[PDB]
Amino acid sequence: FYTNPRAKGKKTMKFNVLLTTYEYILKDRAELGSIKWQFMAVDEAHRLK
DNA sequence: CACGTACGCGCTGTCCCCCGCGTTTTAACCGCCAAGGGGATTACTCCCTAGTCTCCAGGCACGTGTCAGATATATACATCC
């Protein structure tokens, strides 16, 4: 995730695109909600109906 | 209180079955429709039925006299020594 994982201040991201599923959005909303995302792309949005 | 003996308890063997562990499966759990019925409230209307009241009469309780079945004698006929 981070270019500097051994730091303790502000950690900037290393990856560009994160592919994930619904189950790990619900499971890891704490570890993923505290990320300033620039874009969301939700495939099969009828699940989000 | 005396006697005596049966059984509670301790010890030992033995075998068997339950526990611990590793591996594989599998269904509980969480998150989803898809519509529809059950049920909890809020408000309203209506009507049947149970409380209340008055009056009376017979059911229940008590007491007492009798009465038919069960029990205990009174006297007469049959019978043993």
PDB file of all heavy atoms in Angstrom, chain B residues 7-11:
ATOM      1  P    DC B   7     -25.457 -57.493  52.439  1.00  0.00           P
ATOM      2  OP1  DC B   7     -26.934 -57.414  52.421  1.00  0.00           O
ATOM      3  OP2  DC B   7     -24.751 -58.381  51.491  1.00  0.00           O
ATOM      4  O5'  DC B   7     -24.872 -56.017  52.275  1.00  0.00           O
ATOM      5  C5'  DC B   7     -24.755 -55.174  53.422  1.00  0.00           C
ATOM      6  C4'  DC B   7     -23.470 -54.352  53.397  1.00  0.00           C
ATOM      7  O4'  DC B   7     -22.370 -55.105  53.982  1.00  0.00           O
ATOM      8  C3'  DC B   7     -22.984 -53.917  52.015  1.00  0.00           C
ATOM      9  O3'  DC B   7     -22.447 -52.615  52.106  1.00  0.00           O
ATOM     10  C2'  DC B   7     -21.882 -54.931  51.728  1.00  0.00           C
ATOM     11  C1'  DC B   7     -21.264 -55.046  53.109  1.00  0.00           C
ATOM     12  N1   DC B   7     -20.433 -56.264  53.314  1.00  0.00           N
ATOM     13  C2   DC B   7     -19.369 -56.234  54.222  1.00  0.00           C
ATOM     14  O2   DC B   7     -19.121 -55.189  54.830  1.00  0.00           O
ATOM     15  N3   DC B   7     -18.630 -57.354  54.404  1.00  0.00           N
ATOM     16  C4   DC B   7     -18.922 -58.462  53.728  1.00  0.00           C
ATOM     17  N4   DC B   7     -18.166 -59.544  53.942  1.00  0.00           N
ATOM     18  C5   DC B   7     -20.000 -58.512  52.801  1.00  0.00           C
ATOM     19  C6   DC B   7     -20.720 -57.400  52.626  1.00  0.00           C
ATOM     20  P    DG B   8     -23.090 -51.403  51.278  1.00  0.00           P
ATOM     21  OP1  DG B   8     -24.373 -51.058  51.917  1.00  0.00           O
ATOM     22  OP2  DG B   8     -23.038 -51.750  49.843  1.00  0.00           O
ATOM     23  O5'  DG B   8     -22.075 -50.201  51.541  1.00  0.00           O
ATOM     24  C5'  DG B   8     -21.848 -49.755  52.870  1.00  0.00           C
ATOM     25  C4'  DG B   8     -20.391 -49.375  53.091  1.00  0.00           C
ATOM     26  O4'  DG B   8     -19.586 -50.564  53.283  1.00  0.00           O
ATOM     27  C3'  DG B   8     -19.733 -48.584  51.969  1.00  0.00           C
ATOM     28  O3'  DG B   8     -18.946 -47.552  52.539  1.00  0.00           O
ATOM     29  C2'  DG B   8     -18.878 -49.631  51.244  1.00  0.00           C
ATOM     30  C1'  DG B   8     -18.511 -50.591  52.366  1.00  0.00           C
ATOM     31  N9   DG B   8     -18.358 -51.974  51.933  1.00  0.00           N
ATOM     32  C8   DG B   8     -19.213 -52.682  51.133  1.00  0.00           C
ATOM     33  N7   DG B   8     -18.839 -53.912  50.933  1.00  0.00           N
ATOM     34  C5   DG B   8     -17.675 -54.039  51.669  1.00  0.00           C
ATOM     35  C6   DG B   8     -16.826 -55.152  51.831  1.00  0.00           C
ATOM     36  O6   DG B   8     -16.950 -56.284  51.345  1.00  0.00           O
ATOM     37  N1   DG B   8     -15.744 -54.858  52.649  1.00  0.00           N
ATOM     38  C2   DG B   8     -15.510 -53.632  53.226  1.00  0.00           C
ATOM     39  N2   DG B   8     -14.417 -53.537  53.994  1.00  0.00           N
ATOM     40  N3   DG B   8     -16.305 -52.582  53.088  1.00  0.00           N
ATOM     41  C4   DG B   8     -17.364 -52.856  52.294  1.00  0.00           C
ATOM     42  P    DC B   9     -18.217 -46.456  51.623  1.00  0.00           P
ATOM     43  OP1  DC B   9     -18.271 -45.177  52.361  1.00  0.00           O
ATOM     44  OP2  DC B   9     -18.755 -46.525  50.245  1.00  0.00           O
ATOM     45  O5'  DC B   9     -16.705 -46.957  51.606  1.00  0.00           O
ATOM     46  C5'  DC B   9     -16.112 -47.411  52.812  1.00  0.00           C
ATOM     47  C4'  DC B   9     -14.760 -48.043  52.551  1.00  0.00           C
ATOM     48  O4'  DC B   9     -14.922 -49.450  52.234  1.00  0.00           O
ATOM     49  C3'  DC B   9     -13.972 -47.434  51.390  1.00  0.00           C
ATOM     50  O3'  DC B   9     -12.628 -47.252  51.789  1.00  0.00           O
ATOM     51  C2'  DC B   9     -14.090 -48.498  50.301  1.00  0.00           C
ATOM     52  C1'  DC B   9     -14.102 -49.760  51.137  1.00  0.00           C
ATOM     53  N1   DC B   9     -14.668 -50.939  50.438  1.00  0.00           N
ATOM     54  C2   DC B   9     -13.986 -52.156  50.482  1.00  0.00           C
ATOM     55  O2   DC B   9     -12.918 -52.220  51.101  1.00  0.00           O
ATOM     56  N3   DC B   9     -14.512 -53.225  49.838  1.00  0.00           N
ATOM     57  C4   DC B   9     -15.663 -53.104  49.179  1.00  0.00           C
ATOM     58  N4   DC B   9     -16.152 -54.182  48.562  1.00  0.00           N
ATOM     59  C5   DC B   9     -16.373 -51.871  49.129  1.00  0.00           C
ATOM     60  C6   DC B   9     -15.842 -50.826  49.763  1.00  0.00           C
ATOM     61  P    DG B  10     -11.693 -46.164  51.069  1.00  0.00           P
ATOM     62  OP1  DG B  10     -11.430 -45.093  52.055  1.00  0.00           O
ATOM     63  OP2  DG B  10     -12.279 -45.818  49.756  1.00  0.00           O
ATOM     64  O5'  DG B  10     -10.337 -46.965  50.812  1.00  0.00           O
ATOM     65  C5'  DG B  10      -9.776 -47.743  51.859  1.00  0.00           C
ATOM     66  C4'  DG B  10      -8.954 -48.887  51.298  1.00  0.00           C
ATOM     67  O4'  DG B  10      -9.832 -49.951  50.857  1.00  0.00           O
ATOM     68  C3'  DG B  10      -8.077 -48.520  50.102  1.00  0.00           C
ATOM     69  O3'  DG B  10      -6.739 -48.923  50.343  1.00  0.00           O
ATOM     70  C2'  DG B  10      -8.702 -49.288  48.934  1.00  0.00           C
ATOM     71  C1'  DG B  10      -9.371 -50.459  49.631  1.00  0.00           C
ATOM     72  N9   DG B  10     -10.517 -50.982  48.896  1.00  0.00           N
ATOM     73  C8   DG B  10     -11.644 -50.289  48.543  1.00  0.00           C
ATOM     74  N7   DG B  10     -12.511 -51.004  47.889  1.00  0.00           N
ATOM     75  C5   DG B  10     -11.921 -52.254  47.798  1.00  0.00           C
ATOM     76  C6   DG B  10     -12.399 -53.435  47.195  1.00  0.00           C
ATOM     77  O6   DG B  10     -13.470 -53.609  46.606  1.00  0.00           O
ATOM     78  N1   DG B  10     -11.493 -54.482  47.323  1.00  0.00           N
ATOM     79  C2   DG B  10     -10.278 -54.393  47.957  1.00  0.00           C
ATOM     80  N2   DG B  10      -9.538 -55.509  47.980  1.00  0.00           N
ATOM     81  N3   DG B  10      -9.818 -53.287  48.530  1.00  0.00           N
ATOM     82  C4   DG B  10     -10.693 -52.261  48.415  1.00  0.00           C
ATOM     83  P    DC B  11      -5.560 -48.455  49.359  1.00  0.00           P
ATOM     84  OP1  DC B  11      -4.355 -48.244  50.189  1.00  0.00           O
ATOM     85  OP2  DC B  11      -6.066 -47.354  48.510  1.00  0.00           O
ATOM     86  O5'  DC B  11      -5.320 -49.732  48.433  1.00  0.00           O
ATOM     87  C5'  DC B  11      -5.028 -50.984  49.032  1.00  0.00           C
ATOM     88  C4'  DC B  11      -4.986 -52.084  47.990  1.00  0.00           C
ATOM     89  O4'  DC B  11      -6.333 -52.437  47.605  1.00  0.00           O
ATOM     90  C3'  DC B  11      -4.246 -51.720  46.702  1.00  0.00           C
ATOM     91  O3'  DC B  11      -3.176 -52.629  46.491  1.00  0.00           O
ATOM     92  C2'  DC B  11      -5.313 -51.827  45.604  1.00  0.00           C
ATOM     93  C1'  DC B  11      -6.359 -52.730  46.234  1.00  0.00           C
ATOM     94  N1   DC B  11      -7.731 -52.469  45.741  1.00  0.00           N
ATOM     95  C2   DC B  11      -8.437 -53.478  45.082  1.00  0.00           C
ATOM     96  O2   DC B  11      -7.898 -54.577  44.916  1.00  0.00           O
ATOM     97  N3   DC B  11      -9.692 -53.218  44.642  1.00  0.00           N
ATOM     98  C4   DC B  11     -10.231 -52.015  44.844  1.00  0.00           C
ATOM     99  N4   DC B  11     -11.468 -51.798  44.396  1.00  0.00           N
ATOM    100  C5   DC B  11      -9.524 -50.977  45.511  1.00  0.00           C
ATOM    101  C6   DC B  11      -8.294 -51.248  45.946  1.00  0.00           C
TER     102       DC B  11
END
